[PDB]
């Protein structure tokens, strides 16, 4: 090309068929932090974290930046927008989630407690029984069950939803 | 060891004996006085209106004897038939019974926009009731209906309950606002 | 101490004896009693008040006798009683499940709804339009499964306003 | 006017000036960086619901692209909307109210389907709280009382918007003392 736009990027990455690969680290302590926390390993950056870092303006995907880069990553790897928005929100709060084993979930650990977050979206109904069974399964794995409801405009609301035999 | 009599009329049982009406309300907060919306303790004349669900429960517990207006006996199984034949009352009965058997007082959730208001000892005694919404596990909801429940409980405790019932069995989801 | 005694016909209630003449004359004056015939809901109300005897039956036992005897809805009865307590003088309306009363020169039409008896939203809209097109304010009285009554005005319009 | 990208069941407007514009001019969309902005002071992006996106596209205000850059037509957004039972219903009410000059926002904070304003949030004293129904929906009568409860602290008044076959009518409901 002419000139590559690197200024204002803390790292640069490429999108490949199944992942984001970090090609340049312009701020060493930035990438070392992503490595320390577990999201970056040998150039491979977790998909949701790559989308998040792009949304912050710290990760450049080639010459694509900001939320435009975030979208490239979400669309490119087939991430759910609402799961990404909850993920970003949790990261903004200082939490460090991972993709959970159960479909549609994020898990993060805070204060020696593990939280399992089920991401629900307006316009996509679910069975009350499925909510009970999911909550039971989370509790059975020693996770606090949190539901994150994203409305049709992107407003996020969190509740703890605990399955029990008797009110208490 | 309270005993009361009632007349089945519409989908309700009316207890017109004042002393029986007062007893039922005093000893467990059953029923609704028709002359006073929220009594002070026992000071009302009645009659006490029992819901069909309450009447089935009390009959089955041996506390209440129900007659038709013609004076014939309405058995527990006749009340059960009435309750089971109404999809809403059938569902509510199963939760109603489970909470009462567990020692809660269970009242209408009308004023709170819910199916039940559930107390450990009674209205005006608990700081706040548990606000309980009834579901079958087969019911589908939009996720924003969980937020609607939260809005309803926001002034109360933001800590509400979904009672989930099928096959006579009940379990509960205790839901509260959360800040990650 | 009943002020009058009545009996149950197949289709109405007939006052057979007025113990307090003044009482019956007043029921006639306000229109509920005519030629011996007392309107069913008013008979139930007067019984519930302890004022009308049905044979030797008194009070709510007598009210229940009227309601069951004539196949009245208990909830419509309770709503009628409540309106009477407030000082209104309703009659049974033309549309099923309704009462109608006039106050301050305006006519109110009350649709009585009960917990455990669903309706279609379209039915509520159609009822409200019909009341409005008869120049009645449309009021809905919802009676919950314990007998708690709540009233709302419910007005059908093509645009919010 | 504005350009957005379709992603999930939403459209994101990432250009800051377009994002501030759509929000400032009629209160469309939801900024992702702040919940209740003071006027236009947010960075965005602006998330548009699918219903808003269809409305704006059909009014000729919004051009929608997919992430790969290919155009998304009004008929495509219409298909997405009509294929979701909730969004189909809501869209018909949404459109009717916007066409009649109202601002229409999510009713999430009020426990309803819509919060409807004559000028906008923080400007009207209180929104109309609007519950969406088909006339074929069956409800228990106490559901009306539940709606009364939701509106008890805002204004004791509330609206059912009743829609079928694209048409809408409304029931204006308020607490009454006989
Ligand atoms: Cl009950
Ligand atoms: Cl919307």
From TrEMBL, chain A:
Q: Where's the tRNA intron endonuclease catalytic domain?
A: 85-158
SUPFAM superfamilies from the UniProt entry: tRNA-intron endonuclease catalytic domain-like
A GO molecular function held by the record: nucleic acid binding
Q: Name one GO biological process term.
A: tRNA splicing, via endonucleolytic cleavage and ligation
Q: Which domain of life is it from?
A: Archaea
Ordered alphabetically, the record's keywords are: Membrane, Transmembrane, Transmembrane helix
For this chain, the annotated S-S bridges are: 9-60, 25-31
All copies of the tRNA-intron endonuclease SEN2-like N-terminal domain together span 9-77
Membrane-spanning intervals of the chain: 67-88
One family from Pfam that matches here is: SEN2-like_N
Q: What is this protein called?
A: Uncharacterized protein
């Amino acid at each position: 090309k002419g000139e590559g736009e690197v200024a204002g990027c803390k790292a640069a990455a490429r999108l490949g068929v199944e992942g984001v690969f970090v090609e340049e680290c312009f701020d060493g302590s930035y990438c070392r932090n992503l490595e320390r926390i577990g999201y970056l390993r040998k150039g491979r950056l977790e998909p949701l974290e790559a989308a998040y870092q792009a949304s912050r303006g710290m990760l450049c995907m080639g010459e694509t930046r900001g939320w435009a880069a975030a979208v490239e990553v979400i669309a490119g790897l087939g991430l759910s927008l609402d799961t990404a928005l909850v993920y970003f929100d949790l990261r903004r709060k200082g939490r460090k989630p991972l993709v959970g084993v159960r479909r549609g979930t994020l898990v993060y650990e805070h204060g020696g407690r593990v939280y399992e977050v089920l991401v629900l979206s307006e316009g996509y109904p679910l069975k009350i029984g499925s909510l009970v069974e999911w909550s039971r399964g989370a509790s059975m794995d020693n996770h606090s069950p949190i539901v994150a409801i994203v409305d049709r405009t992107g407003l996020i609301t969190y509740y703890e939803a605990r399955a029990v035999r008797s009110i208490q | 060891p309270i005993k009361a009599s009632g007349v089945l009329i519409g989908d309700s049982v009316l207890v017109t004996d004042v002393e029986q009406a007062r007893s039922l309300y005093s000893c467990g907060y059953y029923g609704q006085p028709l002359d006073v919306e929220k009594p002070r303790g026992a000071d009302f004349e009645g009659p006490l209106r029992l819901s069909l669900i309450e009447s089935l429960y009390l009959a089955e517990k041996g506390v209440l004897e129900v007659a038709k207006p013609d004076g014939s006996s309405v058995g527990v199984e006749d009340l059960r038939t009435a309750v089971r034949g109404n999809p809403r009352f059938s569902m509510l009965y199963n939760i109603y019974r489970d909470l009462r058997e567990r020692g809660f007082v269970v009242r209408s959730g009308l004023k709170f926009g819910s199916d039940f208001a559930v107390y450990r000892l009674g209205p005006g005694i608990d700081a706040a009731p548990f606000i309980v919404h009834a579901y079958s596990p087969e019911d589908n909801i939009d996720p924003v209906e969980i937020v609607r429940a939260g809005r309803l409980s926001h002034s109360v405790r933001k800590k509400f309950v979904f009672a989930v019932t099928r096959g006579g069995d009940v379990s509960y989801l205790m839901i509260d606002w959360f800040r990650p």
